[PDB]
Each structure stands twice: as structure tokens, then as C-alpha cells.
Amino acid sequence: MQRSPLEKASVVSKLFFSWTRPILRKGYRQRLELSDIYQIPSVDSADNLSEKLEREWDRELASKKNPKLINALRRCFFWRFMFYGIFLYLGEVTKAVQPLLLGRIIASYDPDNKEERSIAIYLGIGLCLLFIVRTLLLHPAIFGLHHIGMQMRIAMFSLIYKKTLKLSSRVLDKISIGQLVSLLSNNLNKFDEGLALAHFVWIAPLQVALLMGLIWELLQASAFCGLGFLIVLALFQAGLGRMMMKYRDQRAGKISERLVITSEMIENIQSVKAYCWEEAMEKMIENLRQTELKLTRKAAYVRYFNSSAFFFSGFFVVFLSVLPYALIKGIILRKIFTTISFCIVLRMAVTRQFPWAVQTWYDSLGAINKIQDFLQKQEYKTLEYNLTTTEVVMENVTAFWEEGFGELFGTPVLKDINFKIERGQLLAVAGSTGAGKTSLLMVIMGELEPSEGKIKHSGRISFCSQFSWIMPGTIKENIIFGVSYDEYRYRSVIKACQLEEDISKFAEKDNIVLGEGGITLSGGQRARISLARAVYKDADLYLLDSPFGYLDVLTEKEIFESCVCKLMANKTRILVTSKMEHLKKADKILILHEGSSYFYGTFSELQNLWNTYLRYITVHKSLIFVLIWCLVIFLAEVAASLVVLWLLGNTPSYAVIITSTSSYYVFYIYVGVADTLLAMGFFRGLPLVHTLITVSKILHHKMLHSVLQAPMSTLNTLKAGGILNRFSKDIAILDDLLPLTIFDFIQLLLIVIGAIAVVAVLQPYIFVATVPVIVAFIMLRAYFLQTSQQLKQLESEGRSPIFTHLVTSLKGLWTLRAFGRQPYFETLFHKALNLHTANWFLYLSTLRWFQMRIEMIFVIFFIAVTFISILTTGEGEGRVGIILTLAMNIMSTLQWAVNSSIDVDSLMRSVSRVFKFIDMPTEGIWPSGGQMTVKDLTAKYTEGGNAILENISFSISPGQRVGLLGRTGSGKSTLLSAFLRLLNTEGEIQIDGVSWDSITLQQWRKAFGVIPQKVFIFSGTFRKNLDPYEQWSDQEIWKVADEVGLRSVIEQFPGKLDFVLVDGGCVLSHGHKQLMCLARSVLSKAKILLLDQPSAHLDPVTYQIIRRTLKQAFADCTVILCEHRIEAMLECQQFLVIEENKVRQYDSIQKLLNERSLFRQAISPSDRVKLFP
Ligand SMILES: Cn1c(=O)c2c(-c3ccccc3)n3c(c2n(C)c1=O)[C@H](c1ccc(Br)o1)Oc1ccc(C(=O)O)cc1-3
Ligand SMILES: Nc1ncnc2c1ncn2[C@@H]1O[C@H](COP(=O)(O)OP(=O)(O)OP(=O)(O)O)[C@@H](O)[C@H]1O
């Protein structure tokens, strides 16, 4: 990372953007490398801008009764804004007065205009000086405005993240990741560039006043006709803007919903594949896209007319201005040409610059208002004592989850809870599924506010969640969690949590890079990493919500005896548990039942109780037909224009006066009106944008289909930020920005080519004069696009870390707030912001360099032309000047065309990224009895890696019960996934004589019914979550829910079976989701079932629910039951034990437990009575 050249530069180098030379030379030859990017200027760093805006916003909040964010932004940026606006206005003024000199210079070609031939050289000098000053005034101001806009955007994003970290729990249920992602994605690049157009709300009226004053000279009272036409057109454009904004308002919610569903699906792709649910998800997304595309199409239709307003107004203004003048007296061709010259500037001011500025103000003020409304939301109440007597006490606590029901005080989740615990004691909390154990910890943490009662303690806490949270980084980073590294503590914690055995089996040992969510590890490994993180922190109170759910009895016993009771014997602990052995040595015991305290006391009492354009064009067949139709109409118009033009030169008082020496004006007039003569009407414009929108629809469908069928090895590489970035920003670009940009480019190209051909055919000496300018423009464009494409790719990639950080911050907010690590995460977010800023700044600077170089080349050519024309003009007409000035007039449209081509190529990178995503590789009654045979099965996760399971062979009789067991991290889930071909495999598997190499993947996967270890619940109704294909009547669903035991749970919510679940099922407790998975497995009438720990955190009472069902729901079925619970192993006939990456088979569990002394000694005694009666 080398220092940016901007900081240490020169004044002339800054004015001409010369400091960008080293990068442009470097990327023209080769690929840009890591050491090619500069550090950002210190003024753009996120910390400084965040601090400044935060101070101004706090002053605004603390001073005024009606605060406004726009006031703080003004106090931060107004002076520089006005400073650049003044120079922008001075630059724009020079265009208004250019016809005064150019018109006289052109009139001097006529020998009858003896007066203007006297001072031609002075007019030429003045024109050259004007041309030089305009370039110097315009481009630096535009760069300054872009820089200011970038600074505002960065500051606001920092404020948004800081506010997000403080949101109250009651507010979180109303905002999803989709809404925040949409908010960031919408303003990420548009806000910066709007500032370059903002000043035209007052620059344009002054231009109109000056131009009307100047047109009064030539045509006094007849100019008002054209002005009235323009004032009607402006009203029309205002109305069109209102309709477009109305269409945008109705579309945003549907985009947020689609983003939520897509992110959830791609996160749970493994369950999606195991369920064979791909088509259902595709149908859901297609239904959402169909609703949003209609609004997109209507907005595009209204934007087409708004854009075409400029091109169709050219003929009307001139004709309406001239007709009264040419009727009540004569008119000369010179006056007509001068009127056209002035009217071009007038039309650009009225129909292009002012409405764009008005729309920019609308968009920016709306975004700022939305940000302020977000910034004024309800916050987590931190009001509590940070120092007490270390006697943790809870008195008369009654709590409600529903804010409306609680304020109306709707049933309470907690009712009159009392307890008191001393320093260094242990309290064990027990109860049935859904009793309110997690909710009690929520109250103690302060995330759930009680209506009645109160809780007192010191305030330094540590927290271990039922659902583990893993952040991006290594294992050591996940454990030390942003504080200093201590060797003795780290070793003690690593040893105590039984992690050394799993740590010693990794290539990086401990520096393995864990992704977001820890999908590389098993369930028990993630749980133990979370426990180690909780124990590493020093605090006065440790809350542990059921940390032994995914562990075998031996590991659980070791951890409980060596960590909770030995390593923290002198601290205050609250452990949620259901094992009766753990309750014996608890100092105090609390038992919950349906929100009430069934018992509080002691145990002793309880016993007593470039080929990218071509693909894009050929995606859809109708676009080709539309383009050919446009070309045919264009050819007909060109031919008609040529025929009409040749007639005036072949044919010979009237309203128009033409002399012999003044006829050269005719061609000059044609070039001034071709913009209107070759304008694309609604017979060509509307079908084009319609078909481009259709192309966007097709591309999104293909992208989603391609993603859903990739192999797991490919899918495991992608990050959540990358998925969100590609599906949000690139798709939005393809939907909105590409069609109209393409329309503008095509219109400009048609105008240029038509004018060139028509002029050249009659005068084949202008084409040859225009050749060198065209060549120079093309060479410069080719040179610049070699570096520009790479820089745009880097900037596009730079967005992903921001979204990834936001997603991971949202997932683990409660842990972050409990530990008190908000500043650390804020620093990481600022890092991501700066990383994006470097590339974005480098792209903007190079773009400014290119535009200035094009402008300078045009100026040099015009300066050379003007003096030659004046010099070679003698007593006769200046033929050389006549040809050269007309040639230079045509290049004026070519410059605009080249800039339009640059922005089109900039937008096409999104198409290239979508295509890269589309080309991902594809991973691609018979079940009569249920027999299986496995022969030499080997399994691995990546090709050429460690083999988790090597050379396994066994067989199963049809309709038999098999118990799969092993230590946490052995590879039971690996064997379960190998059955469904979810990883890389070798060997053969046969079901009733049919091998998996004889049929397709879908048919093989349809033979199984599965219960995965990770439960997937998406946004939708209860009914939709139970079956997405809608093939069962509500009677059958209700009967199944009766059998599983989900009656009261479903009837607890206002919409019985129609309630919509949000936040991945936030309202449901942990065991209810397992019950929802068992109901899914029951609804599928599958002959072979693979169940991965169906009872993970259930109490023995609730386990009786899953019992009896395996004996009624699945009677004649082959069941493979992976379980850590010893009781469940009493209903198996075959046993498979995984150890040393190998599988061993047993007939009786007494024989199994005879050969393992430690494991037998770990068995609970009541279980031992049930095993050895
Ligand atoms: C006689 N005569 C001009 O005086 C032209 C001018 C012009 C007028 C006054 C001062 C400076 C230039 N302009 C253009 C001119 N043509 C083609 C022309 O024949 C041409 C154009 C106009 C329409 C399209 Br499509 O392309 O490009 C221009 C692009 C932007 C602007 C801008 O005012 O921002 C003006 C353009
Ligand atoms: N955000 C919420 N809004 C409404 N009800 C909720 C919410 N979160 C939990 N509940 C409900 O509150 C009750 C208590 O659930 P909680 O998760 O605290 O139970 P638990 O004892 O931890 O359960 P488990 O043993 O399954 O882990 C349940 O009926 C649950 O559905």
C-alpha cells in the first residue's frame, strides 16, 4: 500500500489530473497487481468523516426541538458546495455566448459580408480563448462535487452502522437484512454523482433569461412562441416525473422480500437439496419477480418519453419562432442558422438539465429523510447498575413478549419469578420444552424488559447461546474475540473444553479460516467453540443456555467435570440443563412450568417433595427483430433526406431569401436539425426498452437456476456478501439503468452516422476532413478502456465485504451486546468502507482524466481549423473554411456519443458478472423392501483431500432399525450425506438391486426421507413451511400436527396455520422447530428414513413424542437413526460405531458397551437400569 500521489503533487498536475499517469501506463500493458492501489487521502478516511458528522448531528439533537439531518450536512459541506457551483456556472455561461463569435466567423465566408471580414482574426482569437477557459472551468468543479458527494455518503453509512448496533429488540422484528441491504445498495453509487447535477436548479433559469435576451435581438416578438412551447413541455416533464416516482414507491417492499427469501434459501441450500425443494423455491421467486417487473416496465415507459423530449423539440421551437418573422417580413438563411445555434443551448437547458436536477433533489432528500427516520428508532435500554454487591437477585418478575399485549397489562411468558444467588454459587434451571428457560436469560441480560418486578446484579456477564454464532476469521480469533491474547488462559481453555483432539486433526491446527456461520465444522465443534469463547472472558456472571445438546455423554461428562465445576469453581454460574446428574451438585435449583415457578430450592428438599455484447444481444430473439426494424426505418429516413437535399441543389421574392454566395448555409442548417429529423419515435422506442427488460428477466431466471444446481464444493466457497451483492446491485442495474442508457447511445450513433453519410455523399471532402478526429477519439478510447475495465471490476468486487459484515453483525447482535465488543466491530466496518473507497476514488479520477483529454483534443483541432479558415479566406468565398467548420460541427455530436459509449461499457461489467455466475458447473415401485448394500464407500469434501471415511462396507435387512453412534466430530453426518451424494464419493450403494449409477440423481434422492441436523424455516405461513408444493389438504396437515404434538403451539398464534413466520422462526422455541422437522418427515411417505439427532435439546418427556411415532408413523420402514441419547438406542436391532475413520458393526448394545469401559462408566444409572435390568 503506497501513498497516493494526490497528497504530494503540483498545482498544474492537480488541474490537469496528470498524477493518474502511472496507473494508466501500468494497466495498458499488463494485469494490475496488489501494489498498484494507493492508500486513500486522509480526508476520506471513515473515522474522521464519521466523527465530524456525529458531532454536528448531536449538536442538532441537543439544541433544536425539531431536528433535521440536512442542517448538519449543510453545516459540514455548504461552503465547498457553493464554491464549486460558482465555477460550474461560470463555465456554463461560456456556451451561451459562443454563437456570437462563431456565427460572425461563418458569415465572413460570404463576400457580401464585408463588415465582418474586417475583424475576423480578433474573433478567432476570442473564440480560442473562450475554448481554453471553458475546459479549465468545467472539469475540476465536477471532480470537486463528486468528491464531496462521496464524503457525505461515507459519513452517513458510518452513522447507519453505529445506530444499527444499538437497536432495541422490539424494533428488530420490523427490519430485516433485505431492508438495510436495499437502503445501502440504492445510494452506493448514485448519490455521489447526483451532486454534479444538483446546481442546475438555479443555473438553468439564468441561462434561459440570458438566451431569451440574446434571441430578442434577431427575432423580437416571435421568440415567445417557442418559449411557450418549451413551458408546456416543462410542465409535461414534471408530470412524468411525478408518475415515475409513484411507480418507484410501490416496488421497494417486493425487492426487500425477494432479497430475504433468496438469502435464506442460499444459506440453507443443503437442506434444500436434501428435501428436493429446488422447484418450489424457484416458483416462489418467479412469483415475486412477476409482480415487480410490471412496475419496472411502466416506469421505463414513462422514462422513455421523458428522455425523448429533447430530441423532438428541435424543429418545433425554430419553426414556431421563425414563422411569424418570415411572414410579416423577409428572413435570411444567416438569421435562421443563428437562431438554431441559440435554440440548441436553450433546449439543452430546458429539457435536459433542469428536470434532471429536480429529480436529483427529490431522490437525495428522500434518501436523507429515510436515513433520519432510521436514526430516530427505539434503542436498547442500557440503564442499569454497573456495580453492586455480587448478590444476584430477581423479584416478582412478570414479562410479556408482545409489546401491545404487555402495555395493555395476551398471556405472560414469565409470571412472578423470584430467586437469589450468592457469589460463587451454581443455579440450575430446568423445565419442559417451551417453558421459558431462554426467556429468563433474556430478561437477565436486559434484552427483554419486565412489566413488573426487578433484577439486580453487577453487570459484567458472559453468555453462551443455544444457537451458536461463528464469525469470519480463525478459531483463535473466534475465541479471544477482540482482546489481547494470553497463552496460559488460552491453553487452559482449549484443554478444558476437549478441543485439543479436534484441533490436532486440522492442517492449519488452529489457524483454519472459519467462514461466516462455521459450515465447515460439525454441530458439537461449533458448540464447544462458543463455550470456549464464553469461558475465555472474565466476568462475574456466566449464563450457559444448554451447551451440551450436540455432545455424547462422555464428552459432556468430561467438560462438565473439568470446566464448570473446576475451572470456574469460584464464579457465579447459571446453567440451563435437563440432566438429573447435573442437578445433584447445583447449589440452587429452579424448575419452570408454563412460565411459572413449579419449584425453587435445593435438591435435598426436591427429593422430599468482446463476446459479452454478442451473448447479451442473442439472449432473446425479439431484440434482433426490433433492432433490424429500427435500422430499416433509419435507412428510409436517410434516403428521403438525401433525395430532398439534392432537390434544392437541382431546383431554383419568397419568405426566404437565398443568394448565390449564401447557399452554403443550407448544409449548415441540415446538421443543425438532423437531431430532430432522425429522432426515434414511440414506434421504435417502446419495443426496444420492453425487450431489454425481458432480457433482464430471462437472465435473472437463468442465474437462480444455475445457482440452485451447483455442487456443494462450489457453493461452499461463496460468501453471503457476494450472493447479496450479485443478486441486488447487478440485477438492479440490469433492470433499471441499462435500457435507457442503451437507448441514448443508439440514438446518438444513428444521428452521427446519418449526418456523416448525407453530408459526405453530396460533398465528398468533409468525410476526409473528419477522418483524423475520429481516429484520435477511437485510439484514446481504446487506450483508456484497458485500465478502466479492471478498475471497475475491482470496485464492483469491493462491495461484498460491507454486506458480509452487516449480515454477520445482524446474526450475532445479542452476543456482541452481552460481551461489549461494539467498538471492535465498528472498526472492522470502517476497514471495509475504506477498502471500497480506494478503488472507487481511483476509478473516478481516471474517468475525469479521460473526459478532459477528449475535450482538449477537440479544442486543439478547432483552434487549428479556425485560423486556417480565416487565413485562406481572401476576396472570394472561404471554401476551405466552409468545409472545415462544417466538419468540426459534426464532431460535437461525436464527443457526446463517445461519452455515452464509455458509460455503456461501464454498465456492461454487471452483465459479465451475471454470465460468470450462470456458467457454474452442474453437480449432475422400486423401493419395495428397503434393503441396502454398501460396497467400498469412500467419502471426502474436496477432491484430493483428507478422507473422512475410507473403505466402508455393510448391509441392512429391509425394515430394520440401525443405531449410528460415535464421538462428536467422528463423521456420522458425513456418512448420512454420502448416502445422498452431497460430497465426493467412491464405491457403490444398492437399494433393492438398483445401483446409484443406474438412475438419475433426482430419482435416487426421492427414495429418502430426511431429518437434518440444521433446521430450515423460511419466511412464509405455517402451512407453506410444512409443504411448499401444496399437495395435502388441511385435514391431513392438522392430523399430522395432532400426532406430532404441535396443536397448542399452532393455536397459540392469531392465524392458526396462516400465521407468517419471520426472522427464521423467531417466535418458536428450539424444540418446536425439531417438531416441525419431524412433521415434515412424517408427511413424506418415504420407505427409507435418515434421521440426524431428531431429539437434540428435548427433555425426556418431550422425547416420548418422537417415541411411539417411530413405531406408528414408520412401521414398515428402514430407519437409520443417528443419536447421542442412550435411551433411544433401546429400539435398534443393528448398530454402527464410527471411530478412526472406520465403521464397525454390532448386533447387541450390551456387547457394544462391554468393550468400552469409559463410555460405559459415563452412562447415567437410570439408563443403566434400563440397559442392564
Ligand atoms: C450549430 N451547432 C451547434 O451550435 C452545436 C452545439 C453548441 C451550441 C452552442 C454552444 C456550444 C455548442 N452543440 C451541438 C451543435 N451542433 C450539432 C450544431 O450544428 C451538438 C449537438 C446538438 C444536438 C446534438 Br445530438 O448534438 O453537440 C453539443 C453538445 C452539447 C452542447 C451543450 O450545450 O451542452 C451543445 C452542442
Ligand atoms: N419473540 C417471541 N415472540 C413471542 N413469543 C415468543 C418469542 N420468543 C419466544 N416466544 C415464546 O415464548 C415461550 C418461551 O419460549 P423459550 O424459547 O423461552 O422456551 P425454552 O424453555 O427455552 O424452550 P426449549 O426447551 O425448547 O429451548 C414459547 O411459547 C415461545 O414460543
Ligand SMILES: Nc1ncnc2c1ncn2[C@@H]1O[C@H](COP(=O)(O)OP(=O)(O)OP(=O)(O)O)[C@@H](O)[C@H]1O
Ligand atoms: N463441510 C465440511 N468441509 C470440510 N470438512 C468438514 C465439513 N463438515 C465437517 N467436516 C469435518 O469432518 C469431520 C466429521 O464431521 P461430522 O459433521 O461428520 O461429525 P459428526 O460425527 O456428525 O459430529 P456431531 O455429533 O458433532 O454432529 C469433522 O472433523 C469436521 O470438522
Ligand SMILES: [Cl-]
Ligand atoms: Cl451565421
Ligand SMILES: [Mg+2]
Ligand atoms: Mg431454550
Ligand SMILES: [Mg+2]
Ligand atoms: Mg453432525
